[PDB]
Design a protein around this ligand. Sequence first.
Ligand SMILES: [Ca+2]
Ligand SMILES: [Ca+2]
Ligand SMILES: [Cl-]
Length: 235
Amino acid sequence: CIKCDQFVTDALKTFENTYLNDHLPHDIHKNVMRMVNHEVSSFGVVTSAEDSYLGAVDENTLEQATWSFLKDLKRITDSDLKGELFIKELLWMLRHQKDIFNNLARQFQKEVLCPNKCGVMSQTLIWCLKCEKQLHICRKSLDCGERHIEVHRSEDLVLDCLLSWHRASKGLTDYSFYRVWENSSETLIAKGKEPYLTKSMVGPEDAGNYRCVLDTINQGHATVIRYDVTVLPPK
Ligand SMILES: [Ca+2]
Ligand SMILES: [Ca+2]
Ligand SMILES: [Cl-]
């Protein structure tokens, strides 16, 4: 994906126009750049199989890969290498950075990509072949499950609808909280950016069922959690 990044293509222009002069005779510059561009353009190419993980990463991972690449490219131009030794180390550096990119992509795939265990998460990916940015949808069943909540009369009732991946999901709008009556109809009792609902001084009338619905701009609901609330007598 690093060919997609302006910093990389700016750096490669400077590499060719300014720094190669210091390391190589002019009449090998253009073919050396063909080697460099070829290597760089292959980052994240998939060859079917089990390396589809290579094909897209999020913007943070691209950024890490870009800066890793820039550091190693500068190391090369700052070096005292010339001639064949320079070319050899340049190619090895590009192969090494490709491995680093692959390790970053594998880490992204394992820990960061679609970490939700329920609900629908949206993530922003850069696709490495043609540099397209796209919203990726991680779709699982919307209902995340049911909380059993007990609260003593006259204490505060708090319903929490925050999941760990909500902060990273894209396009979220509001959390709606509903009271779900015994005839199964429901009443909207809060709606806004707050991932929780507070009801002060609960009484027996607050006992029953509630539901949170987290919505998105255009990808449908992202989370539902249900709450079964018992109001206990005072201690
Ligand atoms: Ca960012
Ligand atoms: Ca030689
Ligand atoms: Cl869990």
